[PDB]
Every structure is written in structure tokens, then in C-alpha cells.
Design a protein around this ligand. Structure first.
Ligand SMILES: Nc1ncnc2c1ncn2[C@@H]1O[C@H](CSCC[C@H](N)C(=O)O)[C@@H](O)[C@H]1O
Length: 325
């Protein structure tokens, strides 16, 4: 599909009657350190990516009864849960996280995040990109579109989070490495990954039901959570609706992530521990995932201005999304 100008894309933003809508008010404004036990998180694990890591095809639980890999799958599942039992009893891998909710409003392709409900002083800006090709019967989406425009005068909110399967991951994996035990090195890293993703799922439910509080009576099964049968999204920097990784630095500042969790960012803006998830929370009922995809030089240069970066810097961070050489 052919490219459009930045202005043409913005003229085709997500269309919504903000005058008739009351964005749900965040019940708990502020930043809260959290933790979750392995016992708590194991009921929020999505096991299917675990089997994928072990190069086995099929959806859990059906994979256990499969005819070619079911026996192997059952053995992997037993070893995994045996290791979860031990990590749990010995408290040797300890999931940690932090959550925050803030007053927020959209301005253009960005989301202003305010110190307080006066909505004057901006403590941070969450910057977003916009789809920039010809859209047939649909908006040129930008994640900012799911927050009320400041011009509408509607009180709106944004959340963020960072969670990890635990700071101990490297020590446990490295010890299996020193033992030449590649099986259990793979296993403990796969389990840390499951616990991080389970914590992201559990904490998102906590946010919808309690911290933000717009779905207090939600009652979804784990399978329904895996199918994303809830209202709102938790998009993560680096993923297709917000591919620009340096926005993780804004999450780290907003939530004081390292102070509250021990989690760190690298020079490439990768998270440490490896088993880590971070992202935003959007409440809007029409919010959804999509791909920004390829963008043009006008949007790159505008993003650079808004970020305080040179055009050269932004072309490094957005290299995979450049629709030009
Ligand atoms: N287009 C997109 N833009 C931003 N984030 C996306 C995205 N598509 C998926 N995600 C992210 O990926 C997560 C889903 S994958 C994680 C849950 C899954 N049950 C598992 O264990 O693997 C989403 O919650 C969101 O954080």
C-alpha cells in the first residue's frame, strides 16, 4: 500500500466521539512496587510458548495428549513443574514488578503524562508513531489516539508496568551452564520467561480490576486471558504498535523501575533480567494491537524533534520501520 504524508495520516486518525465518552478514572494514581510468588503466578502461565521453546508444536493442554510428542511434552511438563516446586519452596527465584497510573491526555501523536490532576506540569511524554500508508476503510492508527485529546477537556489516564521472573535468573542458569547441564539451563530460563509473562498477565488483570478499576467484576479464565478477551491493551515498546525501544527509558523514569525492582536497561534498551516485560496500559474499549509498519522521512524528522534527538539518532532507533533508504 502506497505511502501517505504525515499530515494525511494525521487527518485520518482514529475517529471517536470524545464528547459523549467518559474515560474511566484511575482509582489508584501513583507508583506501587509489587511482587508475586511462584505459587500465585503458576496459575497465570501460558504454557504453549514454553513448549515452543522446546521445539514442540501444538497448544497446551492438547499437546500432552498428542501422539508423536505427547510423551516428551508430558516429561517436559513434569520436569518444569518439579523445578517450579523447588524454586518456590527454596525462594531462589523471586518475581518482582512495579505498576503506575497517571493523569494523561493526547496531544498530536504523543501522550502527555501529568504530575497531578491540575494537568499542567508534564512529568514525561510518551511518544508514538502513526501508520503512514493508504488505509482503506480504517484509521491510520497511533496509540495516542486511544487517549482523550487535551482539547476535549476529558480527564484521562495512562498506566505503565515493568515485571521480571526474578533477578536470580542469571545465577541459576549460569550454574547449570557450569555443570554442562544444558537441559536445565534451558529449563530454568524457560520457566523464568513463563513467570515474567505470567506476571505481566496477572498484573494487567490487577490493573483492569483494581488499580485502574474499570472492570471490577471481570471474571475470565486463564484461557480467556490468553485469548485477550478483556477490555484494553498492554502494548510493549519494541513490539509492532510501538516499535521504538528507547521509550523504555521513559517507563524506567516514570516508575523508578530500577529502584523498585532491580531491573535494568542496556545500551540497546534491552531489559535485564532477560525474563522481563514492560509496557503501557490503555483502557479504551476500541484500543487494539496493530503494526505501525513503514514510515517516511517527514515522520522520522518530526519524531526526532519531539524526542530531542537528531535525525541520525532516530534513523538508528527506527531502522526496521524506515520506508526509505
Ligand atoms: N502490535 C503490538 N504492539 C505492542 N505490543 C504488542 C503487540 N502485539 C503483541 N504485543 C505485546 O505482546 C503481548 C502478548 S504475548 C504475551 C502473552 C502470551 N500469552 C504469552 O505468554 O506469550 C501483549 O500483551 C503486548 O504486550
Amino acid at each position: 500500500t502506497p505511502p501517505v504524508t504525515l499530515e494525511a495520516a494525521r487527518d485520518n486518525d482514529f475517529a471517536f466521539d470524545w464528547q459523549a465518552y467518559t474515560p474511566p478514572v484511575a482509582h489508584r494514581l501513583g507508583v506501587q512496587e509489587v511482587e508475586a510468588s511462584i505459587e500465585t503466578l503458576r496459575n497465570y502461565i501460558d504454557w504453549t510458548p514454553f513448549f515452543m521453546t522446546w521445539s514442540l508444536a501444538g497448544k497446551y493442554p492438547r499437546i500432552l495428549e498428542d501422539e508423536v510428542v505427547g510423551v516428551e511434552a508430558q516429561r517436559l511438563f513434569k520436569d518444569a513443574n518439579d523445578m517450579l516446586d523447588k524454586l518456590s519452596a527454596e525462594k531462589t527465584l523471586n518475581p518482582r514488578g512495579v505498576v503506575g497510573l497517571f493523569p494523561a491526555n493526547r496531544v498530536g501523536d504523543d501522550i502527555e503524562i501529568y504530575r497531578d490532576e491540575t494537568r499542567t506540569h508534564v512529568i514525561n511524554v510518551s511518544h508514538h508513531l502513526r501508520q503512514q500508508t493508504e488505509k482503506t476503510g480504517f484509521a491510520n492508527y497511533c496509540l495516542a489516539d486511544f487517549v482523550a485529546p487535551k482539547l476535549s477537556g476529558k480527564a484521562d489516564y495512562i498506566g505503565a508496568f515493568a515485571v521480571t521472573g526474578g533477578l536470580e535468573e542469571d545465577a541459576l542458569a549460569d550454574a547449570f551452564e557450569a555443570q554442562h547441564d544444558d537441559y536445565n539451563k534451558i529449563m530454568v530460563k524457560a520457566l523464568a520467561d513463563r513467570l515474567a509473562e505470567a506476571f505481566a498477565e496477572y498484573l494487567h488483570e490487577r490493573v483492569r480490576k483494581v488499580y485502574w478499576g474499570y472492570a471490577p467484576n471481570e471474571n475470565l479464565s486463564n484461557e480467556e486471558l490468553i485469548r485477550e478477551n478483556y477490555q484494553g491493551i498492554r502494548p510493549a515498546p519494541g513490539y509492532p504498535a510501538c516499535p521504538e525501544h528507547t521509550e523504555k527509558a521513559t517507563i524506567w523514569e516514570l516508575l523508578e523501575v530500577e529502584k523498585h525492582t532491580g531491573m535494568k536497561l542496556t545500551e540497546s534498551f534491552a531489559m535485564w533480567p532477560g525474563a522481563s516485560v514492560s509496557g503501557w496500559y490503555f483502557s479504551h474499549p476500541d484500543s487494539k494491537y496493530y503494526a505501525v509498519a513503514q514510515i517516511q522521512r517527514d515522520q522520522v524528522e518530526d519524531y526526532a524533534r519531539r524526542k530531542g534527538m537528531s535525525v541520525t539518532e532516530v534513523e538508528r532507533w527506527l531502522a526496521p520501520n524506515l520506508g526509505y533508504d
